[PDB]
Amino acid sequence: LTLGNTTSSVILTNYMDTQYYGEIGIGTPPQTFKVVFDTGSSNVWVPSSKCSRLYTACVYHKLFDASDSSSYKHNGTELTLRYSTGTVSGFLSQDIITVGGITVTQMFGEVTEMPALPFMLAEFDGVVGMGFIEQAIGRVTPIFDNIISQGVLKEDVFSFYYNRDSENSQSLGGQIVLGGSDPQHYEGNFHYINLIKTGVWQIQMKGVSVGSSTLLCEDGCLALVDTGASYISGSTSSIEKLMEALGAKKRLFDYVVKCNEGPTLPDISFHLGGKEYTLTSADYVFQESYSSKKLCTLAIHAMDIPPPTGPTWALGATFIRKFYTEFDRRNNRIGFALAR
Numbered sequence: 001l002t003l004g005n006t007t008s009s010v011i012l013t014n015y016m017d018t019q020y021y022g023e024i025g026i027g028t029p030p031q032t033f034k035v036v037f038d039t040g041s042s043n044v045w046v047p048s049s050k051c052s053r054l055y056t057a058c059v060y061h062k063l064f065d066a067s068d069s070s071s072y073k074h075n076g077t078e079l080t081l082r083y084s085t086g087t088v089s090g091f092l093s094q095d096i097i098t099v100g101g102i103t104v105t106q107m108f109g110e111v112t113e114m115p116a117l118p119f120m121l122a123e124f125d126g127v128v129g130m131g132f133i134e135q136a137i138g139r140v141t142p143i144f145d146n147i148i149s150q151g152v153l154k155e156d157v158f159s160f161y162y163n164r165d166s167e168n169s170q171s172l173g174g175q176i177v178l179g180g181s182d183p184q185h186y187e188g189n190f191h192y193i194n195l196i197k198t199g200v201w202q203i204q205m206k207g208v209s210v211g212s213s214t215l216l217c218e219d220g221c222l223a224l225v226d227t228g229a230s231y232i233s234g235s236t237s238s239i240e241k242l243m244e245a246l247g248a249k250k251r252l253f254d255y256v257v258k259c260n261e262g263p264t265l266p267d268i269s270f271h272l273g274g275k276e277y278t279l280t281s282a283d284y285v286f287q288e289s290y291s292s293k294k295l296c297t298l299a300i301h302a303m304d305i306p307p308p309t310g311p312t313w314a315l316g317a318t319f320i321r322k323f324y325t326e327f328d329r330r331n332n333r334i335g336f337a338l339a340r
């Protein structure tokens with residue numbers, strides 16, 4: 001490890017409190033892409049100009065054209081990336097990537113197969129994996145590992161700030177700091193929780209409290225700190241019990257409560273590293289109305305993550321909005337502080 005004296009920041013756009021994305025430039029001259037920065041994955045990918053136009057997602061998203069780049073280096077190794085909500089398939093390519101003022105030579109996926117669901121619902125074009133090399137498909141060096149190798153960053157850490165609002169604009173949607181943290185977006189001090197294993201941004205959770213009593217995760221469970229996930233997720237059985245306690249009901253892809261009942265829902269506390277991380281109903285209910293005639297969605301869903309990573313809870317944008325998050329690679333730990 002070689003450390004420098006610089007930090008780099010990536011300004012994020014907040015789309016409806018569900019999507020947080022920044023811009024990256026690829027090639028010479030740069031081709032700009034809207035990307036989600038995901039601690040739950042380790043690969044970089046953008047849709048390719050070689051993606052057949054019968055993939056509707058490829059007609060609607062920005063495509064990388066290797067034939068328009070003078071710094072492109074051919075590879076062609078076939079690559080399939082299987083996520084929680086979808087799969088992308090393509091080939092590996094090498095080019096110069098610009099991330100918040102930093103220029104880095106990177107091997108990335110050129111996506112030729114991009115299904116309509118969920119990609120047509122996506123505001124971002126691609127993904128920048130913030131996970132470890134051990135979980136990278138095709139043993140490709142992740143972008144942060146390649147930035148660290150330059151010897152410019154002050155610390156072997158990166159931090160996430162996700163703002164509220166989304167609806168009104170003018171305000172900063174969010175921010176990623178490479179090589180440090182931004183004291184302007186957090187208050188008090190960081191509390192760290194050590195990783196259960198290197199290779200994955202996952203920590204031990206001691207319990208989940210719904211109101212007064214510790215209803216769930218009695219005798220521990222796992223928690224994935226997932227920046228690319230919109231909500232807080234748990235297994236079907238854990239969520240079924242949590243939602244029964246809240247009076248919520250299953251609706252295809254989400255749970256809903258009567259809008260008027262939203263402000264009466266209890267606090268949900270996550271027991272991580274001896275500290276209690278509390279979300280009130282305003283932090284987990286999308287209060288679109290206070291009407292008894294309308295149904296309001298919850299920012300908590302069921303997601304069955306399979307082994308080796310799962311069964312596991314995922315702490316996404318819903319958690320991050322409340323708690324400014326620092327990802328420490330040098331010490332294999334995650335830090336939380338109250339966001340401001």
Ligand SMILES: Cc1ccc(F)cc1Oc1c(C(=O)N2CCNCC2)c2ccnc(Cc3ccccc3)c2n1-c1ccccc1
Pocket residue numbers: 018019036037038040041083084085086118119121122123127226227228229230231
């Ligand atoms: C496909 C994908 C890759 C990387 C990434 F950062 C996010 C990704 O997309 C993912 C997830 C998801 O698959 N995750 C797995 C990897 N870590 C982040 C969550 C994912 C998990 C849970 N909920 C949503 C919300 C959702 C689910 C279905 C349809 C609409 C919205 C997810 N989305 C997503 C898809 C489209 C637009 C916005 C988000």
Ligand SMILES: Cc1ccc(F)cc1Oc1c(C(=O)N2CCNCC2)c2ccnc(Cc3ccccc3)c2n1-c1ccccc1
Pocket residue numbers: 117118121251252253254
């Ligand atoms: C439009 C529609 C009508 C009847 C119906 F049975 C389903 C419908 O579609 C619905 C929803 C949905 O059920 N809605 C009803 C309540 N409010 C939102 C739309 C619905 C609710 C939340 N998220 C998605 C998006 C989504 C997509 C994939 C994975 C996760 C999430 C939804 N889709 C949907 C949209 C496009 C394609 C497929 C489904």
Ligand SMILES: *[C@@H]1O[C@H](CO)[C@@H](O)[C@H](O)[C@H]1NC(C)=O
Pocket residue numbers: 074075076077
């Ligand atoms: C692709 O690049 C990587 C560099 O690590 C290597 O595994 C492989 O030999 C390359 N394949 C081609 C066809 O250039």
